[PDB]
Amino acid sequence: CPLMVKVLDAVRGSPAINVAVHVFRKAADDTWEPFASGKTSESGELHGLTTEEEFVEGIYKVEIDTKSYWKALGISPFHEHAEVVFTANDSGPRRYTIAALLSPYSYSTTAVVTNP
Amino acid sequence: CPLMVKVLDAVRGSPAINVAVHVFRKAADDTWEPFASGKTSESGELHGLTTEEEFVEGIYKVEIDTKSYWKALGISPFHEHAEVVFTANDSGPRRYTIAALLSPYSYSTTAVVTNP
Amino acid sequence: CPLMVKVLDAVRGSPAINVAVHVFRKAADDTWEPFASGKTSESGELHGLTTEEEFVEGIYKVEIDTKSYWKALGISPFHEHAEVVFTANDSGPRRYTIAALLSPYSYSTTAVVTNP
Amino acid sequence: CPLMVKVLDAVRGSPAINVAVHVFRKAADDTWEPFASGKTSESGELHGLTTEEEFVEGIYKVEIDTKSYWKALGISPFHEHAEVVFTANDSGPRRYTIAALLSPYSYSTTAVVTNP
Numbered sequence: 001c002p003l004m005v006k007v008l009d010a011v012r013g014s015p016a017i018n019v020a021v022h023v024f025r026k027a028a029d030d031t032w033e034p035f036a037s038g039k040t041s042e043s044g045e046l047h048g049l050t051t052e053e054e055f056v057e058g059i060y061k062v063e064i065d066t067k068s069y070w071k072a073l074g075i076s077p078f079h080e081h082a083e084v085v086f087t088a089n090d091s092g093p094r095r096y097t098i099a100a101l102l103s104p105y106s107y108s109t110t111a112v113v114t115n116p
Numbered sequence: 117c118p119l120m121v122k123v124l125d126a127v128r129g130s131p132a133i134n135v136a137v138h139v140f141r142k143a144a145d146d147t148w149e150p151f152a153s154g155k156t157s158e159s160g161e162l163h164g165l166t167t168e169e170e171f172v173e174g175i176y177k178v179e180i181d182t183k184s185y186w187k188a189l190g191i192s193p194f195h196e197h198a199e200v201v202f203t204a205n206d207s208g209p210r211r212y213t214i215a216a217l218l219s220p221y222s223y224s225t226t227a228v229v230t231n232p
Numbered sequence: 233c234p235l236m237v238k239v240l241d242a243v244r245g246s247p248a249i250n251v252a253v254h255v256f257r258k259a260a261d262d263t264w265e266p267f268a269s270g271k272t273s274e275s276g277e278l279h280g281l282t283t284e285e286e287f288v289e290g291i292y293k294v295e296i297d298t299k300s301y302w303k304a305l306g307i308s309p310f311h312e313h314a315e316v317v318f319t320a321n322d323s324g325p326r327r328y329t330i331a332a333l334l335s336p337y338s339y340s341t342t343a344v345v346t347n348p
Numbered sequence: 349c350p351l352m353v354k355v356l357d358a359v360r361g362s363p364a365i366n367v368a369v370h371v372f373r374k375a376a377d378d379t380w381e382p383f384a385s386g387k388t389s390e391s392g393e394l395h396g397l398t399t400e401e402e403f404v405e406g407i408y409k410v411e412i413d414t415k416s417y418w419k420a421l422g423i424s425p426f427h428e429h430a431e432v433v434f435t436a437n438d439s440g441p442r443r444y445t446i447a448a449l450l451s452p453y454s455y456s457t458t459a460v461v462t463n464p
């Protein structure tokens with residue numbers, strides 16, 4: 001699995017469950033082409049977005065739909081989403097974990113990049 | 117000052133100086149129209165982006181050029197930029213501060229929304 | 233002002249007001265001797281803790297009473313307090329700002345060390 | 349496993365390996381009694397600190413030896429350590445994950461608490 005997303009909820013001290021995630025890749029014409037999407041599991045993790053063959057070099061955007069998450073919990077948050085934009089696989093294939101820690105008016109994101 | 121941006125550097129424990137910041141407002145056709153921009157000061161702050169008259173309700177994007185910041189310091193970063201997307205609301209308090217804390221592979225952002 | 237503390241609330245997007253802060257200095261026998269204390273202001277800030285003459289090199293602990301803060305707001309928190317322990321160095325820049333961003337089950341802290 | 353610690357490095361985008369961790373528990377006399385210790389693995393994770401039988405109700409301190417970590421990488425950081433202090437098991441046994449994201453002048457910590 002070359003691209004995994006993990007989301008935590010800093011209000012409840014729990015995984016952030018059922019968070020929608022949309023991944024885009026910048027096309028030759030500089031538009032964002034949908035690439036993959038999914039939603040976090042009961043563990044806060046989203047696996048299976050893509051394959052090693054499909055996940056070529058490029059600029060990717062991982063959109064985490066934080067507003068939709070909070071509004072389901074009846075909470076009115078600040079951000080529309082949390083966006084993570086990065087160049088991937090420019091020195092060959094790597095495995096990426098994008099992590100995000102959510103609060104209503106804040107978020108933190110980090111990346112763990114490993115070479116298989 | 118309805119909108120201020122502050123950027124800090126978690127590697128050196130310092131303001132993040134001379135960071136380019138671009139602000140956009142979402143147009144009716146869902147594109148991002150340039151709205152304001154500047155470079156953070158010696159204190160990591162960017163003031164004077166807009167006025168009360170011009171800063172109407174709507175969705176805004178603040179794009180912080182973190183990659184150029186790290187590259188100018190000789191450091192290899194993960195993200196292309198940090199993006200903060202939010203809705204300005206007239207019901208809420210008047211003044212918005214968007215703060216960002218930068219590391220090479222991670223950033224945190226929060227919003228402080230206050231009244232005078 | 234050699235030492236300032238700033239506290240923000242990530243649930244409401246606001247300064248964290250009326251937070252008790254206690255500062256200690258490590259004594260030669262390795263105990264923590266009271267040094268300074270106060271409550272954050274309406275802006276989330278605590279100034280005037282010490283003077284240049286009194287703030288000599290050594291190890292200091294800043295203890296932010298986050299549990300009482302959340303309890304006064306009717307919210308159930310994880311931590312007893314947030315502790316920030318660091319060495320003051322005269323080689324480094326003069327002025328220390330300790331900032332903390334609070335959520336019920338998470339906090340972030342950074343140091344900004346600058347010269348005038 | 350009722351108490352697990354995970355540490356990430358925000359400069360390298362990697363697990364923080366070989367981080368020493370010391371856990372203490374407040375005694376009846378209000379001193380901190382050593383409780384358990386260990387060091388993070390190649391995954392940044394520390395398992396096996398304690399057992400369900402041993403991990404009774406109490407106030408615990410998880411000390412993460414961040415200064416020793418950075419100084420091994422030849423880096424001179426701000427904090428002496430990152431301390432996480434919390435009441436555990438006060439509504440019966442729970443499983444705790446303490447996570448920390450490290451930079452030289454900052455850290456973030458969160459807790460995930462689950463009911464088995």
Ligand SMILES: O=C(O)COc1cc(Cl)c(Cl)cc1Cl
Pocket residue numbers: 122123124215216217224225226238239240331332333
């Ligand atoms: O917000 C401030 O003025 C200073 O303190 C902070 C700065 C940042 Cl960038 C973050 Cl994420 C949190 C705090 Cl408390």
Ligand SMILES: O=C(O)COc1cc(Cl)c(Cl)cc1Cl
Pocket residue numbers: 006007008099100101108109110354355356447448449
């Ligand atoms: O889950 C981990 O990999 C470690 O804990 C964290 C989780 C999140 Cl979501 C974030 Cl943003 C940081 C850390 Cl250290």
